[PDB]
């Protein structure tokens, strides 16, 4: 699709869709959900050159509700999008700790470096400093650690002696009776590579006769538990993590639309095809069927256009 692209006609379609009295929402869906993010940026530039207004600001004014949130989300470049989500998680009343955990645990070091740069450019403060001020306790420690390198950019070579020592230390940390040693869990889970951690989880099972997930579930609670389990799930299979995130955004009463939007939008050009496959395998139904059950209107139709064919 990106073999060679003139954005001008698409910009004109959007102009006609919003100009005057009445809004053609379907024409907005047909352009923005069928073009790539980079093509959208070209469309935005053409729109401003031709018509003198910023496309995103125009979209924010012309549209409302969930449909507006989704369409505007599509207009953010990668990394800047996550920076906006993280800012929104902290700037309001309360902290949306779940948003922060998801992004920090599921992104790679190099992705996080880009998100950190975008966050400082757009909001004039350091992401790490804002997290330090807005969170506390052990949650604060793991989140800061995930940003503070927490690298791997790995090999396939794991040090077997260190993997065994890490597993021994995790076991010992769980076994202390007047307070789990949370810092030992945090350091190993946040500073070791994914490949090393997979071996640690294997060794931990042999030593402890308990899965690492069940140990975390019995030894921790609340946000710290969520954060640890998220690191574990992302290490084992990232695509499966995102499927589960989407499932729980929709399961039961109501919808966590913020979570649905963010995960579909941010994964749309990376692994949404694998997420769809994993969703089917894990839950015995398609992603689209749950979206159809939980959402309505132009919002629903835009989500389904993005997801694409889902037999």
Which residues are part of a known binding site for Ca(2+)?
Answer: 250, 252, 254, 294
User: Is 256 among the residues that bind Ca ion (CB under 5 A)?
Assistant: no
CB of 249 vs Ca ion, minimal distance in Å: 8
Interface mask toward Ca ion for 171-210; x: CB under 5 A: ----------------------------------------
User: DSSP states of the chain as a string?
Assistant: -TTS---HHHHHHHHHHHSSSS--HHHHHHHHTTS-HHHHHHHHHHHHHHHSS-HHHHHHHH--HHHHHHHHHHHSPTTHHHHHHHHHHHHSSS--HHHHHHHHHHS-HHHHHHHHHHHHHHHSS-HHHHHHHH--HHHHHHHHHHHS-------S---HHHHHHHHHHHHHHHH-SSS--HHHHHHHHHHS-HHHHHHHHHHHHHHHSS-HHHHHHHH--HHHHHHHHHHHHHHH-HHHHHHHHHHHHHSSSS--HHHHHHHHHHHTTTTHHHHHHHHHHHHSS-HHHHHHHH--HHHHHHHHHHH----
Q: How far apart are the first and last CA of the chain?
A: 23
Residues making up the binding site: 250, 252, 254, 294
> Hey, what are 48's tokens?
């401003």
Q: Which is nearer to Ca ion, 255 or 286 (CB)?
A: 255
Pick between residue 135 and residue 259 the one whose CB is nearest to Ca ion.
Answer: 259
**Shortest Å, Cβ 25 to Ca ion:** 23
CB of 290 to Ca ion, least distance (A): 8
Taking the complex as a whole, how short is the minimal distance between the CB of residue 255 and Ca ion, in angstroms? 5
Q: What is the smallest separation between the CB atom of 65 and Ca ion, expressed in angstroms?
A: 17
* Residue 120 touches Ca ion, criterion: CB under 5 A: no
**Does residue 294 bind Ca ion (CB under 5 A)?**
yes
CB of 188 to Ca ion, least distance (A): 36
Number of residues that bind Ca ion (CB under 5 A): 3
Question: Which part of the chain contacts Ca ion (CB under 5 A), choosing from 3-11, 61-69, 125-133, 293-301?
Answer: 293-301
CA distance to 60, 129, 149, 183, 200, per residue, from 141 (Å): 36, 12, 13, 8, 21
The interface region with Ca ion, picked from 49-57, 103-111, 279-287, 291-299 by CB under 5 A, is: 291-299
> Considering only 21-29, 60-68, 186-194, 251-259, which stretch makes contact with Ca ion by CB under 5 A?
251-259
Evaluate whether 310 touches 288 at the Cβ level (below 8 Å): yes
**Of 228 and 260, which CB lies nearer to Ca ion in the complex structure?**
260
Q: Closer to Ca ion at the Cβ: 14 or 246?
A: 246
Q: Which is nearer to Ca ion, 132 or 255 (CB)?
A: 255
Which range in 50-58, 79-87, 101-109, 294-302 contacts Ca ion by CB under 5 A?
294-302
CB-nearer residue toward Ca ion: 127 or 250: 250
Query: In the complex, which residues of this chain contact Ca ion (CB under 5 A)?
Result: 250, 255, 294
């Amino acid at each position: 699709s990106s073999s060679h692209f003139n954005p001008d006609p698409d910009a004109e379609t959007l102009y006609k869709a919003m100009k005057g009295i009445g809004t053609n929402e379907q024409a907005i869906i047909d352009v923005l959900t069928k073009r790539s993010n980079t093509q959208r940026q070209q469309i935005a530039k053409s729109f401003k050159a031709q018509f003198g207004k910023d496309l995103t600001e125009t979209l924010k004014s012309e549209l409302s509700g969930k449909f507006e949130r989704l369409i505007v989300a599509l207009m953010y470049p990668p990394y800047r999008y996550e920076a906006k989500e993280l800012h929104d998680a902290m700037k309001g009343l309360g902290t949306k700790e779940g948003v922060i955990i998801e992004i920090l645990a599921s992104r790679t070091k190099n992705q996080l470096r880009e998100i950190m740069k975008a966050y400082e450019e757009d909001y004039g403060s350091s992401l790490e400093e804002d997290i330090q001020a807005d969170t506390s306790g052990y949650l604060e420690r793991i989140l800061v650690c995930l940003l503070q390198g927490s690298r791997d950019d790995v090999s396939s070579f794991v040090d077997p002696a260190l993997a065994l020592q890490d597993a021994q230390d995790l076991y010992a940390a769980g076994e202390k009776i007047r307070g789990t040693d949370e810092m030992k869990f945090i350091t190993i889970l946040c500073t070791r590579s994914a490949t090393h951690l997979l071996r640690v989880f294997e060794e931990y099972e042999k030593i402890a006769n308990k899965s690492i997930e069940d140990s975390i579930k019995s030894e921790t609670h609340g946000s710290l538990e969520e954060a640890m389990l998220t690191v574990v799930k992302c290490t084992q299979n990232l695509h499966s993590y995102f499927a589960e995130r989407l499932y729980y955004a929709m399961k039961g009463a109501g919808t966590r639309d913020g979570t649905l939007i963010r995960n579909i939008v941010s994964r749309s050009e990376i692994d949404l095809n694998l997420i769809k496959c994993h969703f089917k395998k894990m839950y015995g139904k398609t992603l689209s069927s749950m979206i159809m059950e939980d959402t309505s209107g132009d919002y629903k139709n835009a989500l389904l256009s993005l997801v694409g064919s889902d037999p």
